[PDB]
Every structure is written in structure tokens, then in C-alpha cells.
Design a protein around this nucleic acid. Structure first.
Ligand code: ZN
Ligand code: ZN
Lengths: 116, 98, 287, 214, 56, 56, 10, 217, 49
DNA sequence: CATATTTTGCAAAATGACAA
RNA sequence: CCUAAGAGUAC
DNA sequence: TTGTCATTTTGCAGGTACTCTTATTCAATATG
């Protein structure tokens, strides 16, 4: 969705119909700041959310001692050592697919097979 | 358990002074946009600010507690995934030696 | 071989069993059952060790089920009869612009899911666009109902200073810190609602504290000495209104502290809970 | 037309259940009518346009010789099907006046969706005429053929008197059956009437119970 | 337990006692068996109370 | 006796290997969820059944 | 419920 | 099942599909709201084929420029006997002509449903601003209120193979297998009337429903 | 091999009453609970004085 | 100096409208 | 003597 | 001249026996 704020009073901008050009127009509700629309999308509702499963990855995620290590192939460094963890989305119906972070390149690669 | 003890509680002011000295940003002038990947520092459940280099801060806090400058009953937890740093000095915490 | 660690009350050996309780000043988020309208509740049992030592429970509740559309987040402030919307609280603390409020709540610009889930709150609070207006709103919801309109602002200020998140501070000028903490609580609530983290386990032993003889005797003595000092003040007022002479010995009543401590330790009850103090078992050394 | 086919199939099942209900009540309905096939029903009660007609689907039944001997107080019965999904006051009034002027002691109204409460209040007409309303959805499956549902036989007044006399019972000491139970509605029980229940017990082969309508 | 890595679904990590009572239980297996026995005792107490009430 | 203990250890090892193979299938998402339950529930059901029949 | 665990209801 | 089709596995599958409740919430991957200035062309290149089929096959001047787009799940349409035509017909029937709905074909790479609320001839100078909100409300009710197939209070149906004792024509009681449906949730009155099953032999854990549907005995 | 700490001894997870049990790891756990509750009722010398 | 008084589990019943 | 509380036995 | 639908308040009780010990009975100001 990528919500955007007014640059005059730092307030929300809502979508608005236009007649002269028949275009989406973002408007302020308190200072009448009006501008164009970057995208026609104004509302996204993720019934099945794919993002958030790799959330929590940090530039020094390897410093965590509780995270298990692995020697699986890294398809950017060909390095053995890396850390791995399951999906971070805590929904009960998520799959048990694993994610790997290389400690020398910080590239996240999965163990999935349908995607590959 | 045989080796389990209960903390008696200490004054958190020295730890707050250590945090301020070592580079803890005060919470009053913290703007999340300019410091997105900042580790929030909690002392006894009070969010006191953010730190931009949590690894060095945790290392020096561990060194201070391991030489006795910080009371050993004080518990320091670094949650990397959540990007949080919690320090507890209150009484009633049950710990064991390792 | 006797190890000590027990009292002798009236010739009987009494031991104070370590009383377990939930830790204070920790934010805990819990899901709610289907019949309830609120789906998730984030609460903190705020308490200050070096003050009045009173428990004030702040709750942040997310109204509406998963299929509901009006998902408004409301906070239960102490001494307020209604659940105030969160954005009203942010504006009362001194953060008027919506962008700054959302920055205080959501720390990631790309986290558009949290922004979408949080838009109903700003939509609800659009009616109030000023700090004084929000303070008046809170005062109007104030349960005292004995304050004139222009002093409702002061009443709300007192609520937000000495009653809202006491564990942070009791002084003034720290509105930003309390606003940041409220944003953090709402952030935790929204993370739990977005199925990004599980609800907090109430049985996690790291969230529990054991009150030993120290804290128990401390709170009992605090109450008992408050009683004694109130008695001292009452005696002083009585002897100054009657213009009689003032004496220290006639003022203090050591029987208060002595009898209170002896009663709390002699009987199980801990007041003026049960079974806090028990007769020490002497059947066997291991016992 | 699949919706039309399922609707006419449900209507045919309802018609079969209604005929079974009337025959079980003691009236003279031949076995052939009960087992009427789908094609014959569609030829008779459905027009060329494919829309079944209910006006000519309503019918009249009469008690058989055995029922007359056992129940020498009950006469002809009328079963009506409504066409419009919602039954108004005017249609119910026409039905009840038609029942009254034809001297029917019982009249079954079979409706599609619902009856207006303004028509429910006028359902109780002048005695001894009684009006029973049934929903076609509830009449799709004959509950009495379920193995959990045992055999129900209405008792005559003489039989009820004999039952109370032999067992030294009062009216209230019999087991009760509500005057809203699906089987009681199926058989048209009135309050005070006793049904004998034949059951396949497992300790003895056959067990007979009795339930009084309340 | 803090003796296992994160996201370990192996039988030993989630409470499979591969040792007999004759051989003896490892500390983790001992703790897991203690958890199972605690569940059994709690169930026994709850069951006897509930059955008493139902019987009355 | 010795041979019986060796056979028991072999059986336990074989069951643990089957559990490891099921875990590899689940972690590769190749496992299919049983109708009426999620992926994780099916995986847990299979693991528990394997361990139970191993003990038996 | 019950009580405990009136009814519902009453 | 009906005795003549007790072991017929595909008939059991047919009945399982017939009774199991399915909602759009279990099928729609995601939903979106877009601003298309004209209801004749779209700004999304992916679904332009859908519009250039539907408009070519076929009035449109009274359609709101706001559009609601639903992306469905291929697996949901696979494991259950559901297709784009069926769900489109269900939406059209439950919303009458108030909502213009188009859908991609089943063989298409992405399952897309595009909806536009029709514009009444009465001009409104304020409903245009809240049109997006109205569409949101319509999407909300379209997620749960409408049912694709199956009767209500049926969370999930599973199929099992039972083995009963049937008297053989020669005299003995032989073991004969049947397919049996176990259903989460109880809608006994509505399930019992479904054709293809044996109405006599239906049974329920909830004896309250049995009592209120079948009788006190 | 990424350990940060080491247990001083696993047998220190037990309490005072359970530390008396010989070979507690060869027992069914309810038996250990029974002995823990029952050794407090054991008879001996509680104090030397 | 001594006795007297200041955690848990919901379906409804009730309410405020209401609409012509 | 009453009341309250605590500990415990067998289920 | 009749249905409608949609928020706000409504009551609670927890198994059977049995053993032992400990504390406590309103404090204190006020008038006869
Ligand atoms: Zn603006
Ligand atoms: Zn790499």
C-alpha cells in the first residue's frame, strides 16, 4: 500500500476522486494539501501472508548462539557454515520449511522445493 | 533447586550511568526513522533509550559483571531477533550458577 | 547443624514461604476468546519500587474480531470510566501530527500491514486535533465528575502524570517517554495480532518473582509505619487544637508496630493473603 | 435448469412424505400413490414449462374402515400446497374458510418458506376443525423411517382408558411427549392422546412404551 | 530446554526417552519424564474430584 | 541378553532414521498434509506414530 | 455456566 | 451413503463436496482496491485479457471507477471441486446486478476476480468520496457472508472406510466395506435432506439435534 | 559446538528432598514425587540439641 | 482506675429505538 | 468451647 | 398497528472420609 503523509503538517493523505482528469488524487484532511497518486493501489489485504517469515534477520544474526548451524550449500559463496531457522510466521498452518543465512554474505536461501 | 538463589535487588542508577557513558542514546531525542536498526535498552522494564552497537555494549556489560563492577545478580538479556536489550536488577528473580 | 532463616514468634518457629507473583513493569499480550469483542489485550502491571508501591494496571485492547472491520485500539486509563482511544492519548501527551504518532507506534516504514491495521485508530481520533481538546476529552470521561470545565485539563494532566505509567516517572516533562512506551505497547499488541509472535506464556518462570521475607516484611512495615505516622499526625493535630503540651513519648505508640508485626508473623494472614507464615516443620532435618 | 430439477425432486420427496403421513394417520391412501416415481409425478403435477403447479397438487383423503371402527369421530382430511413462497393473510383465510365450508375436522397446510404471524393467530379456527402447518423443507425426509425412530401408534379413547385402568395410572404419571415433537406433528397428536411406542429392545425382543401428549 | 538449538524437532529434543529404566535416563529425558508424571498426577486429582461430583 | 539389546538398539535407530527422513521431507515441503489437519499436525502425527510403534 | 463453568443462562 | 452407492468412491467424493462448507476466505489469496478511470481498459497488464474477452463478448457508463480485485488460490481450487465459473455465478446471484463481476478462466495462470459496484442514475456529490469505503464493506461481507457450496455449520468433512456386517445372500454375515463421512459441526436438518446419502442411517454426537429433529424417542 | 555455558552438574536440578533418592533416573517419575513428599515424614534426628 | 462505643464459562432478558 | 488458618493420610 | 435489529445487564460454585497444630477473640479514648 505504501501510505504517505502530508509534508506540510505531517498528517495522513486519503484517496479522492477527480473529475477534470478522472485520476486518483491524494488529499489532506486538515490543510488541503493535494497531490498525484503514485500507484492505483489504495488497499491491500493479505489473506495468506508470505512476508514476515524471514523477519528478525539482523546484520549480526550469527552472533546468536541458540541458532543452529548447518553446512548446506550457499548459492552465493559456496560456503558451508551458515545459520538456519524455521518460518517466523506464528500461524498454526505455516509449513516447516527452513531458511538459511550465510554468515559470510548474509544471503537468505530456503530449503523449499516447489519454489525451486 | 539445590543451587537456585533469589536476587535481593540493587540500585539501577550505576547501570544507567554506565549505559549513558558507553553510548546509549537518550530516549527524548530518539527519531526511529534515522535509526531504524537500533536496539531498545530496557532497565527494570523502563525503556531508557536505544543503542546502535548492541554487541559491544553487551560485551562490556558482561565484562563489568564478570569482574564484579556490576552486581552479579543483575541479569542482562540480548534478544537479537527482536532487537531488544533488557537489564533486570529488581528483587525476586530466581537464578542459578553456571 | 541448625541453619536459621526463621523467626521466633511467641516461642514458635515461623517460616515465611516464598510467595510467587507475576513480575511488574512487563508488557504481556494475550489473545481473547471468540465471544468477547476484544481480540487481543496488551497489559502492563505498572509499579514503582521507590514510591507509593501501588499497582496500576494499564491495558491496551484491540476491539473487533478477525472478520470485523472497525478494529479500533483503546486504552484503559486508571480512574477513567471509559476506554480512551490511543490516538487521543498520544495527542494529550503532546504529539499532534498523525505521522509522528505512527512513528512512535510503528518503527518500520515498510511494515504496511501494521499501518493498515492501525489506520482505524487515526480515523477514530481525527475528531480531536489538539492537545487541550484531548485533555478535555479525558477529563470529561473522568469518573470524578466534580471538576469545572477549565480545570478538567489540569485533572487530566494529573492523571497522565501521577497515574499513567507510574513506573516510568512521577515528575512532569517526561511526556515523550510515556508516549514512546505507549507506542511500544501498541507495537507489541499489533505484532501479536498480526500472527508475528505468539501470545505471552503466563507460566514462563522468568516472568515470575518470589517475594521472600525481605519484600513481605517491607510492605507490611510500610503499611504499619504509615498507620503509625498517621496516628502521630492525628495526635499532633489534637494537641495543637486543644493547645495542650506536646510530648514525643505520648505521641509514638510502639504497640502499633510491635503488635502488627507479631500478628502478621504469628498468624498465617498477612495484613492489618493467608498462610504466608507457617510453623517450621521439625519432624526431620530434610523436612 | 439444475435448480429447477433439484426443486422438483425435493417437491416430489415432500409429496411422498405427505402421502406416507396421511396413510399412517389412518386414512385410505393406496400404496401405489406413495411409491409414485419421479417421472409420473413430473408428468402429472408439472407443466410443460417445467414449473411444478401446486394448485392441482392439493388433495383430499378419507378414513379407512379400520380407522373408522377404531376412531368413529374423525372424518375427511384436506392437504393443501401453497404456490407463493410467503403465505399471506388472504390465502390462509381462503384456506380456512374452504376447510370450514367442506366440514373437514383437519386440514394440513404445506407452505414454502414461512407463515405471517398475522396468519398464525387465525390458524385456530372454530372447533372441531384443526389446522396444521408444515414446511416443505421439513417434509423432504420422512423421519419415521429412521432406525432411531421407533413405531408410534395413536391410541383411541377406549384404549387410553384401558391403559390407565390396568396400570392404575393417573394422566400425569405417564411419560410425556411434547406437542411440538416432530413425530407428534407427523401423527397429528392432540393434547391428552397417548401414543404406544413399539421398540426393538436388546434385553427382550419387543418393548412397548406409552407417551401422553402435552 | 536451553541445551538444544532453536527449531530442533528431533525425537530427543521433544521428549523421546530411548533409554530403559534399567539403563537410566539422561538429564533431559529425566526432566521430560518428570513433566509427563506431573501431568499424570494433576489428571488424577482432577479426575477424582470431578468423578465425585458427577457421582453425587 | 546381548543380541536382544543390540536388536532393540537397531530398531530404535531405524525408527529415528525414519523420523529423520520424514523431517527432511517436511522441511523440503514435499510432505502433503492429511485431509482434516495442517502440515505440522500431520508431521507430528507421523512422528508420534513411528516412535510409538518403535517402542512397541 | 453452571454454576460453575447460571446455565447458560440464569 | 445410499446402499446402491456405498462403496462408490467418486460418489462419496461428490457427497463430501456437496455438504462441506466453503467460503471465499479459504480460497482468496488476497484482495486489493484499484482506481481504474474507465471500466473498459485496465492499468494492470496481467488481467487485460480478461477484460478484452468479457467486453468483446458483450451499459458500462454506470460503473464506478473503483475496482475490487481478488486473487484466488490454485491449491484451494484444486483440492475442492470449485471453479471460476461456479464462484462467479455465486457472487452474481448473491449480489444480483448491483455488482459487475468478471473472472479469469480456470486454465489461466492466475485466478482473478474483478468487481465494480454499479452506479445508480441518481447523481451524488458525496457518495463518490465514500465509494472506496463502500467497496471495502462489500469486500468484508463477501469474505464471510456468502457461501460457495455446502451447508452451514460444517467446518470440515473427512472420509473414512468402515467395515460393517451385511447378511450374505447365501446366509452368512459377511464383512462389507462402506465409505462414511465424518463432519465437524452439526447441521443435521440440512445434511439429512441432501440427496445421495442414506437419510435413515444418519447419526450425530449432539443428541439435542437428534431429539429436536427426529423426536424424543 | 557453540556453547556459552556449561552445567555445573545436572543432579543439581533436584531439590532437597529429591537429592536423597538413590538412582532417581531409574525410577518412574511419580515414584520420585512420592518419595519427595514422603521423606519429609521420615523419622530420624531433626536436631542434635 | 474500669466498661462502652467507633479463574471460569454465554445465552438470553432487557433497552433504546423505529418506521412506516 | 467456638471460629479461622495451615500441614498431612487414603482415594 | 406490527414486526426488527441491535447494544447493555444477569446471576456462582466447586468430591468423600480421616489426623494433627496454632492463634484469637475490637483497642483506645472517654466518663463514672
Ligand atoms: Zn496537510
Ligand atoms: Zn554466502
Amino acid at each position: 500500500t505504501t501510505f504517505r503523509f502530508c509534508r506540510d503538517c505531517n498528517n495522513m493523505l486519503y484517496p479522492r476522486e477527480d473529475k477534470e482528469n478522472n485520476r486518483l488524487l491524494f488529499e489532506c484532511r486538515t490543510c488541503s494539501y493535494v497531490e498525484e497518486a503514485g500507484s492505483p493501489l489504495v488497499y491491500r489485504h493479505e489473506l495468506i501472508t508470505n512476508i514476515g517469515e524471514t523477519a528478525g534477520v539482523v546484520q549480526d544474526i550469527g552472533s546468536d548462539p541458540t541458532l543452529p548451524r548447518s553446512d548446506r550449500e550457499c548459492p552465493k559463496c559456496h560456503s558451508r557454515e551458515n545459520v538456519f531457522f524455521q518460518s517466523q510466521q506464528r500461524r498454526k498452518d505455516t509449513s516447516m520449511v527452513l531458511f538459511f543465512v550465510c554468515l559470510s554474505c548474509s544471503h537468505i536461501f530456503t530449503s523449499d522445493q516447489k519454489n525451486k | 533447586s539445590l543451587m537456585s538463589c533469589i536476587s535481593v535487588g540493587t540500585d539501577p542508577m550505576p547501570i544507567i550511568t554506565f549505559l549513558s557513558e558507553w553510548g546509549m542514546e537518550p530516549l527524548e531525542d530518539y527519531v526511529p526513522h534515522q535509526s531504524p536498526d537500533a536496539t531498545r535498552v530496557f532497565v527494570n522494564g523502563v525503556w531508557h533509550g536505544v543503542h546502535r552497537n548492541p554487541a559491544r555494549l553487551m560485551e562490556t556489560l558482561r565484562t563489568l559483571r564478570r569482574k564484579g563492577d556490576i552486581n552479579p545478580e543483575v541479569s542482562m538479556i540480548r534478544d537479537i531477533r527482536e532487537k531488544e536489550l533488557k537489564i533486570f536488577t529488581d528483587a525476586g528473580r530466581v537464578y542459578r550458577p553456571l | 547443624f541448625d541453619m536459621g532463616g526463621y523467626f521466633i514468634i511467641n516461642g514458635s518457629e515461623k517460616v515465611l514461604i516464598a510467595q510467587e507473583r507475576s513480575a511488574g513493569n512487563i508488557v504481556q499480550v494475550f489473545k481473547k476468546a471468540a465471544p468477547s469483542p476484544i481480540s487481543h489485550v496488551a497489559e502492563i502491571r505498572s509499579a514503582l519500587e521507590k514510591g507509593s508501591r501501588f499497582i496500576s494496571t494499564l491495558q491496551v485492547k484491540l476491539y473487533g474480531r478477525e472478520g470485523s472491520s472497525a478494529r479500533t485500539i483503546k486504552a484503559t486509563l486508571p480512574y477513567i470510566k471509559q476506554d480512551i482511544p490511543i490516538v487521543i492519548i498520544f495527542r494529550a501527551l503532546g504529539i499532534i501530527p498523525d505521522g509522528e504518532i505512527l512513528e512512535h507506534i510503528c518503527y518500520d516504514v515498510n511494515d504496511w500491514q501494521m499501518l493498515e491495521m492501525l489506520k482505524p485508530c487515526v480515523e477514530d481520533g481525527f475528531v480531536i486535533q489538539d492537545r487541550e481538546t484531548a485533555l478535555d476529552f479525558i477529563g470529561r470521561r473522568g469518573t470524578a465528575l466534580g471538576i469545572k470545565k477549565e480545570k478538567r485539563i489540569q485533572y487530566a494532566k494529573d492523571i497522565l502524570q501521577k497515574e499513567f505509567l507510574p513506573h516510568i516517572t512521577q515528575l512532569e516533562g517526561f511526556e515523550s517517554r510515556k508516549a514512546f512506551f505507549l507506542g511500544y505497547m501498541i507495537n507489541r499488541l499489533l505484532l501479536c495480532a498480526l500472527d508475528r509472535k505468539d501470545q505471552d506464556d503466563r507460566d514462563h518462570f522468568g516472568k515470575k518473582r518470589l517475594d521472600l521475607a525481605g519484600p513481605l516484611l517491607a510492605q507490611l512495615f510500610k503499611t504499619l509505619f504509615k498507620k503509625l505516622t498517621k496516628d502521630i499526625f492525628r495526635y499532633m493535630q489534637r494537641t495543637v487544637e486543644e493547645a495542650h503540651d506536646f510530648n514525643m513519648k505520648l505521641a509514638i505508640n510502639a504497640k502499633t508496630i510491635t503488635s502488627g508485626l507479631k500478628y502478621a508473623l504469628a498468624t498465617g494472614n498477612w495484613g492489618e493473603r493467608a498462610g504466608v507464615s507457617q510453623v517450621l516443620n521439625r519432624y526431620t532435618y530434610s523436612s | 435448469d439444475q435448480e429447477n430439477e433439484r426443486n422438483i425432486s425435493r417437491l416430489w420427496r415432500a409429496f411422498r412424505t405427505v402421502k406416507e403421513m396421511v396413510k399412517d394417520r389412518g386414512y385410505f391412501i393406496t400404496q401405489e400413490e406413495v411409491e409414485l416415481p419421479l417421472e409420473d409425478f413430473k408428468a402429472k403435477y408439472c407443466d410443460s414449462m417445467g414449473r411444478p403447479q401446486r394448485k392441482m397438487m392439493s388433495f383430499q383423503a378419507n378414513p379407512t374402515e379400520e380407522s373408522i371402527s377404531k376412531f368413529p369421530d374423525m372424518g375427511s382430511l384436506w392437504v393443501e400446497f401453497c404456490d407463493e413462497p410467503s403465505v399471506g393473510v388472504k390465502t390462509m383465510k381462503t384456506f380456512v374458510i374452504h376447510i370450514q365450508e367442506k366440514n373437514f375436522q383437519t386440514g394440513i397446510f404445506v407452505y414454502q418458506n414461512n407463515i405471517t404471524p398475522s396468519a398464525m393467530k387465525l390458524v385456530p379456527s372454530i372447533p372441531p376443525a384443526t389446522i396444521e402447518t408444515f414446511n416443505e423443507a421439513a417434509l423432504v425426509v420422512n423421519i419415521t423411517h429412521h432406525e432411531l425412530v421407533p413405531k408410534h401408534i395413536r391410541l383411541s379413547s377406549d384404549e387410553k382408558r384401558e391403559l390407565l385402568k390396568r396400570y392404575r395410572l393417573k394422566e400425569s404419571q405417564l411419560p410425556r411427549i411434547q406437542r411440538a415433537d416432530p413425530v407428534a406433528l407427523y401423527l397429528g397428536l392432540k393434547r391428552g392422546e397417548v401414543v404406544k411406542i413399539i421398540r426393538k429392545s436388546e434385553t427382550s425382543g419387543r418393548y412397548a412404551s406409552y407417551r401422553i401428549c402435552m | 530446554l536451553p541445551h538444544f538449538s532453536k527449531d530442533d524437532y528431533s525425537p530427543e529434543s521433544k521428549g523421546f526417552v530411548e533409554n530403559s529404566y534399567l539403563r537410566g535416563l539422561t538429564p533431559q529425558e529425566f526432566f521430560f519424564h518428570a513433566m509427563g508424571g506431573r501431568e499424570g498426577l494433576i489428571d488424577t486429582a482432577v479426575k477424582t474430584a470431578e468423578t465425585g461430583y458427577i457421582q453425587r | 541378553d546381548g543380541p536382544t539389546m543390540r536388536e532393540i538398539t537397531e530398531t530404535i535407530a531405524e525408527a529415528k532414521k525414519k523420523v529423520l527422513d520424514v523431517t527432511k521431507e517436511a522441511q523440503a515441503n514435499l510432505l502433503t498434509a492429511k485431509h482434516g489437519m495442517t502440515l505440522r499436525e500431520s508431521f507430528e502425527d507421523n512422528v508420534v506414530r513411528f516412535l510409538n510403534e518403535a517402542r512397541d | 455456566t453452571x454454576p460453575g463453568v447460571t446455565x447458560p443462562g440464569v | 451413503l445410499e446402499p446402491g452407492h456405498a462403496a462408490d468412491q467418486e460418489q462419496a467424493k461428490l457427497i463430501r463436496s456437496a455438504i462441506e462448507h466453503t467460503t471465499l476466505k479459504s480460497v482468496t489469496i488476497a484482495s486489493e482496491i484499484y482506481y481504474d478511470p474507465d471500466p473498459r481498459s485496465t492499468v494492470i497488464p496481467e488481467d487485460e485479457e480478461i477484460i478484452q474477452l468479457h467486453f468483446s463478448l458483450l451499459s458500462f457508463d454506470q460503473q464506478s471507477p473503483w475496482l475490487l480485485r481478488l486473487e484466488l488460490d490454485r491449491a484451494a481450487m484444486n483440492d475442492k471441486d470449485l471453479t471460476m465459473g461456479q464462484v462467479g455465478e455465486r457472487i452474481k446471484q448473491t449480489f444480483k446486478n448491483d455488482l459487475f463481476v468478471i473472472w479469469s478462466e480456470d486454465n489461466d495462470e492466475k485466478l482473478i476476480i474483478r468487481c465494480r459496484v454499479v452506479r445508480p442514475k441518481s447523481l451524488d456529490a458525496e457518495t463518490e468520496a465514500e465509494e472506496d469505503h463502500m467497496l471495502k464493506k462489500i469486500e468484508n461481507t463477501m469474505l464471510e457472508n456468502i457461501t460457495l457450496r455446502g451447508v452451514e455449520n460444517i467446518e470440515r468433512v473427512v472420509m473414512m472406510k468402515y467395515d460393517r456386517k451385511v447378511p450374505s445372500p447365501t446366509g452368512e454375515y459377511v464383512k462389507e466395506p462402506e465409505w462414511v463421512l465424518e463432519t465437524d459441526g452439526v447441521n443435521l436438518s440440512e445434511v439429512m435432506t441432501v440427496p445421495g446419502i442414506d437419510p435413515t442411517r444418519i447419526y450425530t454426537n449432539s443428541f439435542i439435534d437428534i431429539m429436536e429433529v427426529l423426536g424424543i424417542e | 559446538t557453540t556453547f556459552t555455558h556449561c552445567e555445573i552438574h545436572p543432579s543439581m536440578i533436584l531439590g532437597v528432598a529429591a537429592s536423597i533418592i538413590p538412582f532417581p533416573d531409574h525410577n518412574q517419575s511419580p515414584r520420585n514425587t512420592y518419595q519427595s513428599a514422603m521423606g519429609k515424614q521420615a523419622m530420624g534426628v531433626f536436631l542434635t540439641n
